[PDB]
Amino acid sequence: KAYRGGHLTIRLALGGCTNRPFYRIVAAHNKCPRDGRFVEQLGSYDPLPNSHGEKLVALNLDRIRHWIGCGAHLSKPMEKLLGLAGFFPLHPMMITNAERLRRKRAREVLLASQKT
Amino acid sequence: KKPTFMDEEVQSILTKMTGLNLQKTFKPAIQELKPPTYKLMTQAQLEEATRQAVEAAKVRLKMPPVLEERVPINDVLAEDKILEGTETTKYVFTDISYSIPHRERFIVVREPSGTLRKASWEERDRMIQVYFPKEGRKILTPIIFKEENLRTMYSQDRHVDVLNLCFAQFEPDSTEYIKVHHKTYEDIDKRGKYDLLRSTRYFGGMVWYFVNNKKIDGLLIDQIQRDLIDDATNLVQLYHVLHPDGQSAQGAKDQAAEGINLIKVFAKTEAQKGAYIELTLQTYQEALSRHSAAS
Amino acid sequence: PYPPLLRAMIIAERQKNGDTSTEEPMLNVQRIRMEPWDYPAKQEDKGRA
Amino acid sequence: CRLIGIKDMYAKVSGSINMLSLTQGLFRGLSRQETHQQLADKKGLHVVEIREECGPLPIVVASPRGPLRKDPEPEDEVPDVKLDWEDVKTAQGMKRSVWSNLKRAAT
Amino acid sequence: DEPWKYLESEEYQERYGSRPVWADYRRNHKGGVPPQRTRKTCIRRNKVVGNPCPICRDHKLHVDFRNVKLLEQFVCAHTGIIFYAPYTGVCVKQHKRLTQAIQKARDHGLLIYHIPQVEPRDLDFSTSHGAVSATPPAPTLVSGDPWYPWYNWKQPPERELSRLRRLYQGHLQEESGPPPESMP
Amino acid sequence: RKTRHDPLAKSKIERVNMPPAVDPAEFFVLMERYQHYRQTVRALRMEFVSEVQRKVHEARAGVLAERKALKDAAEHR
Amino acid sequence: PMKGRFPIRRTLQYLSQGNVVFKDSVKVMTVNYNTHGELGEGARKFVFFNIPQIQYKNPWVQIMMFKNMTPSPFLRFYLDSGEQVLVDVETKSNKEIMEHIRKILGKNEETLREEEEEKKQLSHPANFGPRKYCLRECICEVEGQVPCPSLVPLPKEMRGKY
Amino acid sequence: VRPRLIAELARRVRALREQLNRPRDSQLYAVDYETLTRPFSGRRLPVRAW
Amino acid sequence: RSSVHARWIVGKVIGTKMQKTAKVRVTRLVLDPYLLKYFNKRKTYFAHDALQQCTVGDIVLLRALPVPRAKHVKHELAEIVFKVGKVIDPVTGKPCAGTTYLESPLS
RNA sequence: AUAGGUUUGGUCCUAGCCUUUCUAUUAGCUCUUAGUAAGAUUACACAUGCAAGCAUCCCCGUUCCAGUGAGUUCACCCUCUAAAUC
Ligand SMILES: [Zn+2]
Ligand SMILES: [Zn+2]
């Protein structure tokens, strides 16, 4: 269609079955259905662990470069994965929620020691 | 400088040793069948068709690259101790690209230590076969690549197809490719079916393996028994070039060995059953006195 | 610094094109300004309801 | 064809399916086959085979029992042959039938 | 219990011959074109149906990855395809077990199947690239500074802290706490 | 979802948007992170934007572009 | 039997068996040919056998055929810049004219191969889309990844039975 | 295409009505200061502004 | 450049009854998807001619216009390729009725 | 279609109708478990509950998603070019 106002968005699209998720990195317009008209599929993210166990993710880094240089507004889980990868700096919230658990384990360590 | 597998001289020598049996290169295989086509030609066009069949047999008989093993990669790109302890399972990543060659694209792993380690060789092969699948390769290693199963196909004399399966599954610079190839070569040296690996592209590879880690005794044995005599000599010649500091080589340029002598020299110098080599030459020359009398 | 992977591809690309050129891949940052969460907007780029 | 020994063949009959014309036409055609040696003798050329299963290898099936003709066969470009629209339909994939390639029992 | 024996016995050459096991069976159906699927199971419960199929008629014909003669009986010889269930007359159950058995024999070695010579995966076989060689290490990595210093906690001045409190009092939450290091 | 003309409900005719408890050092260090990130990914975005513009400009008119154009024209003549 | 003298001309392999893939400069091809005369037999056979092959491969080029208007058979090419190439065909043959136009105003093998390479760039092996465009639809296949529930039941880590 | 004259006319008079009888700033951001409810808007104010 | 689809079209003049306009008939070859034989299909084009130089029956090359003049005039005359009867052999620039040379080529 | 049944006293030809195959909905009779896909007939009338917030006041969003198949060649390519994202 047209969608009055809007931009492209590198985002994740769910495409699996119940209790078995899968996200395909898609460069779709923001005002479009989640699973819908994507301009270019840029990658895939299988979040369930392998039999060996490696949680595979894939990225057409060159085409992601092209669409970012064309004006794609990357969404927050995409920023997380690109930090995890190393194409983008580690996201602030992925270090902040880290330090929130670090101190939460401590809250437990001390309480546990008092119990013992 | 020592010529490797891909020098012009050694590549031509290995070629003649292989041989081009058209009825073995282009052989009836049990695939899906379509009705055969028919043509009517003269003797000249029949000769042209055989020449083109020979050229296509050379194309099918181009030698696979024998290469050295690869150093197991262990290179930590980065280490985010702040991310350490957040995720439980690893997260492998692949620049799928489209035009970057597969030995040039970046595949990395993120571990629960925060380490952004570069992906290993096995993980690299697995990842490229997932995202860029090539016909034949299954990311789980085939169970046919074991001791008892490989021995079963060895007993059923299936060595060419062993090498074919190894080619499809594993990359030549990989350890498995080398181990499986060398175990097959030791097996065929133990019993010995050099006609079974003749006219196949994996002959030049058996030769280098044997000459480099020298066990070419059974090679010369079958070669002369089967009257492959320009071959035998070229095989010695290749041994003499690959080991130029051998006393056999010294005796070769001292005694101006130019033909069969080149072999007798080898027997009397480094052949582990030189009595058998020399004896089969005497029996070959007894048969030669016979067909020279026939001539 | 460039992010780790991007740094690796850049040093590898130039390593390939040829010149070794082992300087660190820095990028300029002073071009980017630092307007914080108090800077005001414009009323024509706005619209009263 | 089980009484004759023919094991692999395709056959479609159309027009009137009368049994006492079906058998007679079948025997007429099968007894008026032209064999490879007769073709080689009639044309003076080698009759050679090209299977896709073996490869580019030429397989001589019938050579003439007399002299070999040395003028090559005339490559008549764009041959004037009467084609069957059913064959061309099956080749181009516009033959849509829910009856054609059905899973049947042996022979 | 252990196969590879009956097909070399005498009763196999008495009941069958050099002929296939499945070359005597005709499935009863509404005439003309057969239904394009055989039954799902000759043996329901422990009862055998009216026309037992080629495999379900001689309890002795066991199916596994080592019964090579039966496997080559049910697979074609001039073409490397497994014969389909209407062709042979076997049930959907056995056909499935036969596909499993043929596959298991194929990657156990006790079955011949044509393997195509594959062409090399890549053209250049070098290993001289950054993903397959080393990289010159990061200043942070030869040191121990974290990549991008903004990841480390660094307490701002208490003047900024109290300015924050002046902005957000009342609903203000607790204090801070420099984050720990080796969380258990 | 709803449109501009759906009567608003009763349950939401009154509902306090009680805001989240603001912690202190996390808020300021989090701001210093948010600003650093926006800056470095802005730098990466400018790099990618100029690379795309470079690709467009050299594909339209580069040096190999003019080379193949003049070769095609000379071959035509 | 298919109707017509040479039924091979309407068989969709003969049409995509031609070799002339006109450049993007040509717009109009005009074929003036003579029905009688022993010299214009090449042009007559070129109209009969090869004009169908030219249009299938060059689908947007106007090909107009003119009969006995001039005493000599000839071809004309109106090109987008404004050009009017003339190729007389008297005392030639249809294969000769075929070769002639593939040399003069026809794309080269490198050009069609290169143009072909750009096409394959679209069908990408890694992409996971429905079987009309891609090759795999989920990673529920790649053996080693968790299967699709439907085929293999998932362990009791699934929700509901938590 | 049959012209949508009525739709165009309705658009035009809607625009002219919006231009002319536009509600002003006074009867817009005014405030019942006890319950924090503006009028003609009916929405109260966020928690950082009471 | 031009917003007109058809850039260059060779056609035939049907009528000159409108002032400074020629009604022209382009004939293109469209493939019957079933019969696979190319059948001529015609589209009527209205060309602008300023000099009233084309009569009915001429073959005319029409080029496009950057932007249509009238509702249907989207093309202009580029050449009266073949003038009714007065046709000059392009190969030998000597007049020719049809199949015969009015003026001889070996002049 | 690998085809078959049926005109007649009988045969041959032409021919219609039907059969055999696969899918979908509904009806009958009868039905154990587990997983998963899919799930008004009606553009007829709808009780009731919920589906649009956010936010230091401005704005922004409620023009999207989600739904339906009434109407029906406003969907594709090129030229030109306005919102829009860089
Ligand atoms: Zn059964
Ligand atoms: Zn799935």
Side-chain angles (χ1 to χ4, degrees), chain A, chain B, chain C, chain D residues 1-51 54-64 66-107, chain E, chain F residues 1-36 38-77, chain G, chain H, chain I:
Chain A
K1 317 179 53 62
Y3 299 130
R4 271 55 55 193
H7 47 82
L8 276 189
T9 291
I10 297 183
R11 51 161 134 172
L12 295 173
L14 197 282
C17 271
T18 49
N19 309 304
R20 169 76 221 282
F22 172 45
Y23 306 83
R24 334 185 302 269
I25 308 79
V26 281
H29 300 69
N30 57 339
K31 276 197 174 62
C32 90
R34 185 187 69 185
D35 316 348
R37 190 198 338 130
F38 55 94
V39 177
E40 184 143 17
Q41 210 216 0
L42 298 183
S44 100
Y45 164 50
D46 167 31
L48 265 281
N50 291 181
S51 82
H52 321 169
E54 285 108 1
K55 255 165 184 218
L56 271 62
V57 160
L59 295 174
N60 222 346
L61 298 180
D62 36 357
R63 305 256 74 230
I64 282 198
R65 168 155 43 254
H66 179 294
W67 284 119
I68 293 207
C70 310
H73 291 219
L74 305 114
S75 98
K76 196 176 41 163
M78 263 336 279
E79 313 242 14
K80 170 170 295 180
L81 259 304
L82 274 185
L84 223 14
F87 199 72
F88 253 30
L90 247 59
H91 195 261
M93 287 267 192
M94 94 194 292
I95 59 220
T96 279
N97 291 49
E99 52 217 22
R100 283 173 186 174
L101 186 62
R102 211 108 106 188
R103 70 205 307 101
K104 176 69 64 185
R105 303 285 280 272
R107 199 161 293 103
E108 180 59 44
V109 173
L110 304 172
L111 283 176
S113 302
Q114 311 305 312
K115 182 61 188 61
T116 295
Chain B
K1 206 273 316 173
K2 164 47 56 200
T4 67
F5 206 106
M6 307 297 72
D7 300 38
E8 268 59 61
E9 210 286 326
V10 52
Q11 263 295 287
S12 180
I13 284 197
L14 289 183
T15 296
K16 313 305 173 183
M17 224 100 65
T18 308
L20 207 57
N21 170 322
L22 267 176
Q23 303 85 340
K24 199 219 282 314
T25 64
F26 300 138
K27 180 208 226 305
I30 45 170
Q31 42 164 79
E32 267 167 317
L33 299 177
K34 278 141 42 210
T37 44
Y38 291 85
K39 232 158 287 189
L40 262 69
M41 71 267 312
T42 59
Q43 205 43 67
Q45 307 164 288
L46 187 49
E47 299 308 328
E48 189 82 27
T50 54
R51 287 173 247 154
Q52 289 171 233
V54 163
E55 281 135 50
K58 311 197 167 325
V59 177
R60 280 246 308 157
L61 260 288
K62 202 220 70 82
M63 314 264 315
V66 161
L67 267 169
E68 297 75 31
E69 284 193 358
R70 59 215 196 176
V71 186
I73 209 151
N74 220 304
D75 292 61
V76 174
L77 276 157
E79 213 159 285
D80 293 283
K81 171 69 204 59
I82 175 65
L83 259 192
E84 171 149 20
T86 320
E87 34 77 20
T88 62
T89 336
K90 307 180 255 199
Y91 274 95
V92 184
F93 297 97
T94 305
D95 176 19
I96 49 160
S97 192
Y98 182 58
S99 60
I100 301 192
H102 290 343
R103 279 187 200 200
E104 269 198 9
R105 49 173 31 67
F106 259 102
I107 307 99
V108 294
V109 201
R110 176 73 87 183
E111 301 183 292
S113 60
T115 287
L116 200 82
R117 186 193 65 291
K118 255 164 34 140
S120 87
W121 273 109
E122 271 57 63
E123 276 148 11
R124 228 195 171 251
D125 276 285
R126 286 209 285 226
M127 281 330 81
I128 303 187
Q129 177 52 34
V130 168
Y131 296 125
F132 279 80
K134 186 202 62 172
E135 249 179 349
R137 213 174 277 181
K138 309 171 71 276
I139 62 198
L140 268 197
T141 55
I143 174 166
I144 209 61
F145 298 120
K146 286 276 217 38
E147 254 328 284
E148 56 278 3
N149 290 2
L150 273 192
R151 180 279 331 305
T152 310
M153 281 185 17
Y154 292 164
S155 83
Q156 284 167 18
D157 214 12
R158 210 115 58 92
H159 306 100
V160 201
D161 319 333
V162 173
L163 295 175
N164 277 316
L165 260 78
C166 181
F167 189 95
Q169 184 61 44
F170 312 109
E171 277 258 24
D173 66 333
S174 184
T175 61
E176 275 282 337
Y177 185 98
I178 297 300
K179 181 199 60 177
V180 163
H181 282 237
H182 288 353
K183 179 187 296 104
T184 313
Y185 293 151
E186 289 302 331
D187 182 71
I188 169 176
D189 202 84
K190 198 220 63 47
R191 23 186 66 73
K193 341 283 176 59
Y194 319 112
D195 199 57
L196 255 287
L197 265 293
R198 260 183 192 102
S199 292
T200 76
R201 63 177 183 179
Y202 304 107
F203 196 72
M206 196 179 55
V207 177
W208 217 224
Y209 170 65
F210 285 164
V211 188
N212 267 305
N213 169 358
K214 313 88 147 150
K215 300 159 276 307
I216 59 156
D217 41 306
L219 260 279
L220 306 312
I221 283 169
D222 196 30
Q223 258 175 351
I224 58 204
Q225 297 159 312
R226 291 201 225 231
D227 310 63
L228 313 155
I229 296 301
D230 181 33
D231 283 358
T233 59
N234 283 43
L235 183 52
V236 193
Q237 271 147 50
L238 196 92
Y239 190 99
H240 274 148
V241 185
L242 187 39
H243 325 289
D245 312 57
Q247 77 270 19
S248 59
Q250 317 313 132
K253 52 270 181 187
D254 286 352
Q255 285 143 75
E258 248 297 300
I260 186 167
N261 1 85
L262 201 69
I263 318 171
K264 301 166 171 172
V265 158
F266 179 79
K268 51 94 169 162
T269 39
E270 303 130 356
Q272 284 70 17
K273 179 25 181 149
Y276 207 143
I277 280 84
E278 293 177 350
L279 161 71
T280 47
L281 291 166
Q282 311 320 328
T283 63
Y284 163 82
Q285 301 160 278
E286 273 142 58
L288 316 162
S289 295
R290 293 145 204 165
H291 47 58
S292 86
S295 297
Chain C
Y2 272 113
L5 196 130
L6 216 172
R7 164 205 149 119
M9 338 213 288
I10 287 173
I11 65 67
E13 81 90 17
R14 64 191 188 187
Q15 191 70 29
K16 178 184 177 181
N17 305 350
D19 204 297
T20 70
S21 199
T22 86
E23 323 97 343
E24 278 294 297
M26 209 27 51
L27 84 185
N28 158 272
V29 194
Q30 259 71 30
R31 167 61 273 174
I32 288 174
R33 285 148 302 103
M34 206 31 40
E35 263 80 10
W37 145 233
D38 40 323
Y39 209 62
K42 200 183 97 57
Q43 223 106 269
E44 294 319 290
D45 299 344
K46 269 186 172 187
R48 193 187 23 90
Chain D
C1 292
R2 270 198 284 257
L3 301 171
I4 295 175
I6 304 177
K7 287 159 244 303
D8 324 292
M9 179 198 21
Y10 171 73
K12 176 100 195 64
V13 310
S14 32
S16 61
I17 293 94
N18 197 31
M19 203 78 78
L20 201 31
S21 66
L22 183 43
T23 65
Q24 204 151 213
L26 191 67
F27 271 101
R28 185 160 165 221
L30 291 186
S31 94
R32 291 164 27 97
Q33 296 185 73
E34 169 195 51
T35 86
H36 287 316
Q37 256 285 339
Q38 309 178 16
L39 174 63
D41 295 359
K42 181 195 56 163
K43 282 257 171 33
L45 311 178
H46 272 80
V47 183
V48 76
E49 198 194 322
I50 297 108
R51 337 176 89 111
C54 73
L57 171 71
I59 315 170
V60 184
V61 199
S63 323
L68 204 59
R69 207 161 38 80
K70 274 334 316 173
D71 40 72
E73 48 148 3
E75 173 265 336
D76 283 334
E77 62 300 9
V78 277
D80 199 356
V81 280
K82 262 133 110 183
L83 288 106
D84 213 36
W85 174 236
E86 335 293 8
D87 299 339
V88 186
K89 237 191 178 179
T90 316
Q92 300 158 339
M94 39 217 291
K95 186 54 180 179
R96 307 182 14 101
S97 178
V98 297
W99 293 108
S100 270
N101 300 259
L102 286 186
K103 311 198 299 178
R104 314 234 200 188
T107 58
Chain E
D1 90 2
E2 210 266 296
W4 194 15
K5 311 312 162 217
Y6 186 161
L7 283 97
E8 302 173 353
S9 100
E10 182 273 348
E11 316 166 3
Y12 182 80
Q13 304 58 354
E14 189 182 358
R15 179 190 185 109
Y16 316 84
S18 100
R19 280 227 308 169
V21 154
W22 48 268
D24 156 79
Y25 176 56
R26 191 168 174 181
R27 37 185 317 217
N28 310 347
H29 63 70
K30 260 154 67 213
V33 173
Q36 300 299 269
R37 250 206 330 274
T38 43
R39 322 182 178 95
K40 200 190 58 60
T41 26
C42 293
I43 318 284
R44 182 168 309 268
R45 210 68 73 256
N46 286 328
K47 313 168 184 178
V48 60
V49 290
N51 213 348
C53 75
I55 279 301
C56 298
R57 60 186 184 179
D58 269 332
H59 55 174
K60 311 292 213 333
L61 278 290
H62 314 342
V63 286
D64 65 350
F65 50 93
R66 285 161 301 112
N67 219 335
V68 186
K69 295 206 319 146
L70 169 143
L71 291 189
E72 98 197 67
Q73 207 180 108
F74 280 97
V75 72
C76 185
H78 318 84
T79 306
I81 46 69
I82 312 193
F83 277 149
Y84 46 89
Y87 195 134
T88 284
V90 278
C91 300
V92 178
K93 186 56 186 177
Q94 312 302 320
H95 183 70
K96 261 167 190 124
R97 298 178 63 187
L98 258 281
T99 311
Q100 294 150 351
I102 294 276
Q103 203 46 39
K104 271 195 82 164
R106 280 178 180 176
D107 56 284
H108 275 356
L110 320 90
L111 219 49
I112 308 100
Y113 67 87
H114 162 77
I115 316 106
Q117 169 164 314
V118 192
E119 49 146 44
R121 171 155 137 269
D122 322 286
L123 303 175
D124 259 0
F125 278 20
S126 88
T127 206
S128 51
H129 200 80
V132 281
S133 151
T135 174
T140 37
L141 206 269
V142 310
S143 93
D145 289 345
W147 218 292
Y148 285 136
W150 43 284
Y151 295 176
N152 304 279
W153 171 97
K154 171 219 66 54
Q155 173 77 34
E158 262 51 58
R159 186 297 209 291
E160 255 84 3
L161 187 277
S162 64
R163 194 182 320 138
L164 170 153
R165 287 160 73 238
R166 181 184 52 160
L167 240 186
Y168 304 107
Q169 43 217 5
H171 38 82
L172 185 62
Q173 208 181 345
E174 303 178 358
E175 221 185 6
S176 48
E181 299 304 311
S182 297
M183 142 207 53
Chain F
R1 292 183 76 182
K2 299 197 212 189
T3 36
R4 309 164 159 245
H5 313 93
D6 322 284
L8 292 182
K10 281 326 172 243
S11 319
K12 332 180 78 181
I13 203 183
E14 93 294 1
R15 156 184 148 267
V16 53
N17 49 104
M18 273 300 297
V22 182
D23 256 324
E26 306 51 59
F27 183 122
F28 202 77
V29 172
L30 185 50
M31 251 159 72
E32 293 332 275
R33 278 194 194 113
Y34 260 36
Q35 68 194 239
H36 264 116
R38 265 149 203 171
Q39 172 161 63
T40 181
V41 305
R42 269 265 290 290
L44 288 182
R45 193 241 281 141
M46 304 334 149
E47 182 48 271
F48 302 151
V49 158
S50 206
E51 163 74 293
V52 168
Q53 213 57 253
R54 278 189 340 103
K55 211 68 60 64
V56 168
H57 209 323
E58 308 329 307
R60 263 186 294 98
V63 82
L64 295 174
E66 282 68 0
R67 188 166 290 96
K68 93 197 155 283
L70 68 100
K71 176 134 280 303
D72 291 326
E75 281 157 335
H76 185 247
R77 255 130 41 216
Chain G
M2 282 165 78
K3 311 192 161 101
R5 196 169 322 118
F6 284 81
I8 202 95
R9 282 147 57 235
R10 315 191 312 274
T11 48
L12 253 204
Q13 186 173 355
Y14 177 81
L15 290 150
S16 90
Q17 189 189 87
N19 72 36
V20 173
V21 196
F22 283 132
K23 303 182 292 190
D24 298 327
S25 45
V26 72
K27 317 239 92 182
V28 174
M29 162 178 183
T30 280
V31 180
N32 281 56
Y33 68 106
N34 274 17
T35 59
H36 299 294
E38 305 85 346
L39 313 158
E41 187 189 270
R44 284 194 297 274
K45 272 165 116 291
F46 168 69
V47 160
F48 198 74
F49 284 113
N50 289 329
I51 294 264
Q53 310 192 259
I54 295 199
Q55 188 101 41
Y56 193 67
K57 287 207 157 182
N58 330 288
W60 307 109
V61 174
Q62 187 179 169
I63 304 180
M64 260 207 166
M65 270 100 88
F66 298 133
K67 234 172 268 209
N68 310 319
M69 329 180 33
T70 61
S72 34
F74 66 96
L75 264 66
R76 217 164 202 171
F77 297 88
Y78 300 55
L79 296 106
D80 195 6
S81 75
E83 290 148 320
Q84 275 160 213
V85 171
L86 210 157
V87 192
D88 91 331
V89 279
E90 204 165 277
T91 74
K92 279 230 214 290
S93 91
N94 53 324
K95 214 186 80 62
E96 276 162 51
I97 327 176
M98 263 285 123
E99 292 175 314
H100 190 105
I101 319 295
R102 82 165 285 101
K103 185 161 174 187
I104 303 291
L105 294 173
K107 289 184 177 173
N108 316 328
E109 289 290 17
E110 293 177 350
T111 326
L112 293 325
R113 235 153 65 221
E114 293 177 350
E115 198 107 326
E116 177 262 351
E117 293 177 350
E118 293 177 350
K119 309 230 307 293
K120 281 310 334 183
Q121 293 176 0
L122 178 294
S123 211
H124 196 273
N127 312 50
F128 285 99
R131 207 89 101 181
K132 155 64 196 305
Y133 297 103
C134 291
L135 290 69
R136 319 185 272 311
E137 193 170 358
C138 211
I139 73 279
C140 289
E141 322 173 359
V142 278
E143 90 283 328
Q145 318 249 294
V146 181
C148 217
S150 287
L151 267 185
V152 177
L154 230 44
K156 219 155 306 307
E157 49 103 342
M158 49 150 155
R159 285 313 65 210
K161 275 56 66 184
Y162 82 122
Chain H
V1 162
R2 213 166 147 192
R4 332 271 295 255
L5 298 178
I6 288 325
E8 182 97 22
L9 171 139
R11 274 194 55 258
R12 161 146 29 257
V13 295
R14 252 196 317 252
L16 168 145
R17 225 84 79 80
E18 188 263 304
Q19 204 269 20
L20 265 52
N21 315 359
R22 158 256 332 283
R24 277 318 209 276
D25 316 49
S26 55
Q27 80 262 33
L28 180 42
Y29 319 110
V31 178
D32 164 283
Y33 279 114
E34 45 282 48
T35 52
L36 266 68
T37 52
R38 296 152 113 90
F40 157 79
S41 165
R43 338 156 75 90
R44 60 201 222 284
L45 280 186
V47 282
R48 306 312 157 82
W50 294 59
Chain I
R1 278 254 300 265
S2 64
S3 55
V4 161
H5 191 94
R7 312 289 290 321
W8 309 83
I9 36 163
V10 156
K12 194 192 220 180
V13 187
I14 304 167
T16 55
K17 292 182 303 300
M18 290 159 333
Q19 276 156 339
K20 297 164 51 183
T21 314
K23 160 160 39 184
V24 172
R25 192 193 303 275
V26 159
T27 325
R28 284 169 227 161
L29 287 156
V30 196
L31 188 64
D32 215 71
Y34 183 77
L35 290 176
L36 292 156
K37 172 182 185 301
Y38 277 100
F39 288 101
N40 265 91
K41 181 169 297 177
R42 291 137 29 151
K43 194 184 204 330
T44 291
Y45 285 92
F46 284 0
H48 185 244
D49 77 334
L51 321 195
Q52 318 264 78
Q53 24 189 3
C54 51
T55 88
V56 287
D58 317 342
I59 301 263
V60 280
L61 170 49
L62 314 186
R63 62 177 315 182
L65 268 166
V67 45
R69 293 166 43 95
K71 190 163 176 293
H72 289 108
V73 183
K74 300 165 307 172
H75 283 83
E76 91 196 355
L77 217 84
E79 169 191 353
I80 314 169
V81 153
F82 287 139
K83 180 78 173 195
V84 280
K86 313 171 184 177
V87 166
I88 310 118
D89 191 24
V91 198
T92 309
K94 204 78 46 213
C96 70
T99 283
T100 58
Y101 286 114
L102 283 174
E103 279 158 38
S104 174
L106 54 137
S107 58

